């Protein structure tokens, strides 16, 4: 199949101690531009960094003094990491990502609900939940009898589910008058045409 | 540093005593997969991504070997300065809209450091699914814990979090 490639963490020459390594690939306009950054963290103290915008291992603390100076000497290490912008970043983006994350499209599930039990001519609230969609770009708008109602509309922030799906709730302050038609509008890049779910008074 | 998409490839976390490690792959906040370090097999978050891509689980075991090595060297280079604990915090919410009859409950713990957390007032575990530690900009971690449940008025649920930064455990009711 396609190959996910990981960077080559360069090596160094009751208490608890934690070490961490990173390999961040910042893509803009596709592969039109890429910025590669590697980070070495010891006890939440980032001490050594390589930034493709620099082109040389730099010391982030006094602890980075040796490791930065050392990794810059041996070119078998520097030229390797420097070139990881193509072997790890560009490769992963143009290869495995396109066949997975950059291809995932999940349409949302739209359901309207009354938070308080319906009492005609008494004020109540409508809630248009929008769940299970990827990516994150989504616009939800509320219509009352064919009129964009932006007043009394409060939408939660984007919610990360952690399994490549999101969630958004958009509450609407309203009062049910008989005959009224409340519709929830959902526009998403995974929808050929906007989804419209109605709720009759 | 903004950009359109961000790939957090090659996350290598190790800590001793305990020889605890982790090797994961993230892209836009969500995790592509981790590598099981005791089974030596890549475990994908989405099974669909498994059939579409591949990653040699051996491309990590070695990285963690490098990370175990650098940690031992750095612990001595600082005269053995221990890591500072950090108080975690949790927020519990359901994945799909909770209709009282099908659904799963998610506990989102953040500000975890060091990465050692233990996630009807009774021990329950139907189809629990925990994830590997996600990286934060402040180099602490966050982790999610799904729970498969069916809601009823008589039944309320909680999320227990055991951490060294907490003098005593805490729980968030829902």
């Amino acid at each position, epitope marked *: 199949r396609v190959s996910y490639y*990981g960077p080559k963490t360069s*090596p160094v020459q009751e208490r608890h101690f934690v070490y961490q390594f990173m390999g961040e690939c910042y893509f803009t306009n596709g592969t039109q531009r890429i910025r590669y950054v590697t980070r070495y963290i010891y006890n939440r103290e980032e001490y050594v960094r390589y930034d493709s915008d620099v082109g040389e291992h730099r010391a982030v603390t006094e602890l980075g003094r040796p490791d930065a100076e050392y990794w810059n000497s041996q070119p078998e290490i520097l030229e*390797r990491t420097r070139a990881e912008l193509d072997t790890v970043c560009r490769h992963n983006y143009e290869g495995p990502e396109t066949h997975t994350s950059l291809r995932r499209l999940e349409q949302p599930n739209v359901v309207i609900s009354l938070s308080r039990t319906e009492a005609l001519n008494h004020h109540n609230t409508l809630v248009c939940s929008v769940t299970d969609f990827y990516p994150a770009k989504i616009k939800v708008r509320w219509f009352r009898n064919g009129q964009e109602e932006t007043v009394g509309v409060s939408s939660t922030q984007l919610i990360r589910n952690g399994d490549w799906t999101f969630q958004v709730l958009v509450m609407l302050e309203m009062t049910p008058r008989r005959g009224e038609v409340y519709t929830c509008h959902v526009e998403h890049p995974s929808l050929k045409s906007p989804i419209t779910v109605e709720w009759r008074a | 540093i903004e950009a359109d998409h961000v790939g957090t490839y090659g996350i290598s976390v190790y800590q001793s005593p305990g020889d605890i490690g982790q090797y994961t792959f993230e892209f836009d906040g969500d995790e592509l997969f981790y590598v099981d370090l005791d089974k030596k097999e890549t475990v994908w978050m989405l099974p669909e991504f498994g059939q579409l891509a591949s990653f040699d689980p051996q*491309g990590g*075991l*070695q990285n963690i070997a*490098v990370v175990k*090595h650098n940690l031992g060297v750095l612990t001595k280079r600082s005269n053995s300065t221990p890591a500072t604990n950090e108080a975690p915090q949790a927020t519990v919410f359901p994945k799909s809209p909770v209709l009282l009859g099908p659904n799963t409950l998610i506990c989102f713990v953040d500000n975890i450091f060091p990465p050692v957390i233990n996630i009807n007032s009774k021990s329950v575990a139907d189809g629990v699914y925990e994830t590997s530690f996600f990286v934060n900009r402040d180099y602490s971690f966050h982790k999610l814990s799904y729970l498969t449940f069916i809601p009823s008025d008589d039944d309320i649920y909680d999320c227990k979090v055991e951490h060294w930064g907490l003098e005593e455990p805490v729980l968030k009711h829902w």
Partner: T-cell receptor
Amino acid sequence: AVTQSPRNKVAVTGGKVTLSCNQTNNHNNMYWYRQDTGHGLRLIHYSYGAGSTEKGDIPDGYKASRPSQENFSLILELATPSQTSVYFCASGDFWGDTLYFGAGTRLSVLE
Amino acid sequence: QQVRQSPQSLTVWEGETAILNCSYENSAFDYFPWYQQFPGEGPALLISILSVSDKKEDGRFTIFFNKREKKLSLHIADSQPGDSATYFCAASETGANTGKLTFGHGTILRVHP
């Protein structure tokens, strides 16, 4: 360099045979290969560092042990006549381009 | 995945060129070291080549790489009898950070005096 030990051993089927290997190159990776006619060099076990051993392509019958960064050792718990071959030890740095091999061990498992 | 080397053994007369070939299946291979093993001792690196280049020439030994057909060829010139040995052809996918090398079965060289 890399010095395997012993360089020649004769053993009986069913006994325990423990080949050993030491290195003075400050390497991190060590491997155990067996050479056979018509099958080339085959990987049995390898180790990225002290404490961990990773299986190779033919790990059946052998056990590995990496107690030191300098020492790697095979272990034939239950020897069989199918094991007789010339065994080789190697090592290389992380992301190590080159492989530094041992001199070789001639094993003879007889009934 | 597998790697093949043909012929299984070769015999060349002194002062003339030996040609040892090697072919690989996995298109992701990019590092191609060659290990020379004399009787009685282990193998040692002789000459390597990366998929970027088509040939690295090291005096008497030259490798010719073909990314298209996924084929290789080692050329030993003015071969002396001190070259009679076994020549392995290895290939690793460096991007995969495996550590594994996956050798070929190796050709056997015989230099006629």
